[PDB]
Scaffold this motif. Structure first.
Motif, PDB file in Angstrom:
ATOM      1  N   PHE A  92       0.659  -1.183  -0.061  1.00 29.22           N
ATOM      2  CA  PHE A  92       0.397  -0.112   0.348  1.00 29.22           C
ATOM      3  C   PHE A  92       1.185   1.286  -0.259  1.00 29.22           C
ATOM      4  O   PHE A  92       0.214   2.342  -0.555  1.00 29.22           O
ATOM      5  CB  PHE A  92      -1.121  -0.406   1.144  1.00 29.22           C
ATOM      6  N   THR A  93       1.301   1.145   0.710  1.00 32.09           N
ATOM      7  CA  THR A  93       2.570   2.126   1.592  1.00 32.09           C
ATOM      8  C   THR A  93       3.655   3.347  -0.381  1.00 32.09           C
ATOM      9  O   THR A  93       3.473   4.445  -1.294  1.00 32.09           O
ATOM     10  CB  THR A  93       3.855   2.602   2.297  1.00 32.09           C
ATOM     11  N   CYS A  95       2.573   2.078  -3.475  1.00 34.81           N
ATOM     12  CA  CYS A  95       1.596   2.906  -4.455  1.00 34.81           C
ATOM     13  C   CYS A  95       1.839   4.108  -3.807  1.00 34.81           C
ATOM     14  O   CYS A  95       1.412   4.949  -4.751  1.00 34.81           O
ATOM     15  CB  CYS A  95       0.176   2.164  -4.081  1.00 34.81           C
ATOM     16  N   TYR A  96       1.564   4.223  -2.719  1.00 34.35           N
ATOM     17  CA  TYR A  96       0.970   6.046  -1.848  1.00 34.35           C
ATOM     18  C   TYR A  96       2.552   6.656  -2.405  1.00 34.35           C
ATOM     19  O   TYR A  96       2.340   7.888  -3.132  1.00 34.35           O
ATOM     20  CB  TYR A  96       0.960   6.183  -0.629  1.00 34.35           C
ATOM     21  N   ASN A  99       2.799   7.665  -6.774  1.00 36.48           N
ATOM     22  CA  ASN A  99       1.569   7.749  -7.462  1.00 36.48           C
ATOM     23  C   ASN A  99       1.231   9.362  -7.198  1.00 36.48           C
ATOM     24  O   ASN A  99       1.718   9.603  -5.653  1.00 36.48           O
ATOM     25  CB  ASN A  99       0.485   6.539  -7.695  1.00 36.48           C
ATOM     26  N   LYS A 100       0.195   9.999  -7.130  1.00 34.90           N
ATOM     27  CA  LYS A 100      -0.025  11.156  -7.300  1.00 34.90           C
ATOM     28  C   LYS A 100      -2.275  11.002  -6.348  1.00 34.90           C
ATOM     29  O   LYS A 100      -2.384  10.104  -6.290  1.00 34.90           O
ATOM     30  CB  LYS A 100      -1.213  12.185  -8.205  1.00 34.90           C
ATOM     31  N   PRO A 101      -1.791  11.656  -4.922  1.00 35.74           N
ATOM     32  CA  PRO A 101      -3.200  11.743  -4.653  1.00 35.74           C
ATOM     33  C   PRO A 101      -4.881  12.134  -5.304  1.00 35.74           C
ATOM     34  O   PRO A 101      -4.439  12.283  -6.305  1.00 35.74           O
ATOM     35  CB  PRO A 101      -3.376  12.969  -3.870  1.00 35.74           C
ATOM     36  N   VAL A 106      -4.844   4.641  -6.793  1.00 34.63           N
ATOM     37  CA  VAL A 106      -4.689   4.849  -5.270  1.00 34.63           C
ATOM     38  C   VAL A 106      -5.765   4.906  -4.513  1.00 34.63           C
ATOM     39  O   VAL A 106      -5.949   4.754  -3.774  1.00 34.63           O
ATOM     40  CB  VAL A 106      -4.145   6.824  -5.586  1.00 34.63           C
ATOM     41  N   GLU A 110      -6.357   2.350  -1.581  1.00 33.23           N
ATOM     42  CA  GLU A 110      -7.903   2.428  -0.474  1.00 33.23           C
ATOM     43  C   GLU A 110      -8.422   1.873  -0.523  1.00 33.23           C
ATOM     44  O   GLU A 110      -8.673   1.582   1.262  1.00 33.23           O
ATOM     45  CB  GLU A 110      -7.954   4.336  -0.691  1.00 33.23           C
ATOM     46  N   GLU A 113      -7.016  -1.169   1.273  1.00 30.55           N
ATOM     47  CA  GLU A 113      -6.504  -1.530   2.794  1.00 30.55           C
ATOM     48  C   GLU A 113      -7.510  -0.690   3.652  1.00 30.55           C
ATOM     49  O   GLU A 113      -8.014  -1.560   4.558  1.00 30.55           O
ATOM     50  CB  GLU A 113      -5.539   0.657   2.883  1.00 30.55           C
TER      51      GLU A 113
END
Ligand SMILES: Cc1noc(C)c1-c1cnc2[nH]ccc2c1
Length: 127
Positions: A92-93, A95-96, A99-101, A106, A110, A113
């Protein structure tokens, strides 16, 4: 360009166990995430060549994906649940970080997660 070798899923001299918590991580946690409509990008290592993301493995130095986690669980690679939980969190981390919010990927991470957190909230106590 080139992809790195994938994370190892086998290592005969690494001590291993089958515990009830690890069984739960496979039977409940992994299975729940794997079947999700947003699971597909996470079911194998990032192919930076096919995706044309040559900077991916410059930025992400500890890659992880559910294909790898699935293999690790099925092949009893782990000693304890925390190792496996760490792999999910790394996935998960990464990916964050990369990438961009607001990016689709993302939003997908989420959603997965959220389910991950719901399931590990009820991780059984060790037998
Ligand atoms: C980019 C990216 N960052 O984390 C993940 C996972 C990806 C990712 C991985 N596989 C994919 N397949 C199609 C789109 C796609 C995006």
């Amino acid at each position: 360009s080139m992809n790195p070798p994938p994370p190892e899923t086998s290592n005969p001299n690494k001590p291993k166990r089958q515990t009830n918590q690890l069984q739960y991580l496979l039977r409940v946690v992994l299975k729940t995430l794997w079947k999700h409509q947003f699971a597909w990008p996470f079911q194998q290592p990032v192919d930076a060549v096919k995706l044309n993301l040559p900077d991916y493995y410059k930025i992400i130095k500890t890659p992880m994906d559910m294909g790898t986690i699935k293999k690790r669980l099925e092949n009893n690679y782990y000693w304890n649940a925390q190792e496996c939980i760490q792999d999910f969190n790394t996935m998960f981390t990464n990916c964050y970080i990369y990438n961009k919010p607001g990016d689709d990927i993302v939003l997908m991470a989420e959603a997965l997660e959220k389910l991950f957190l719901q399931k590990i909230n009820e991780l059984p106590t060790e037998e």
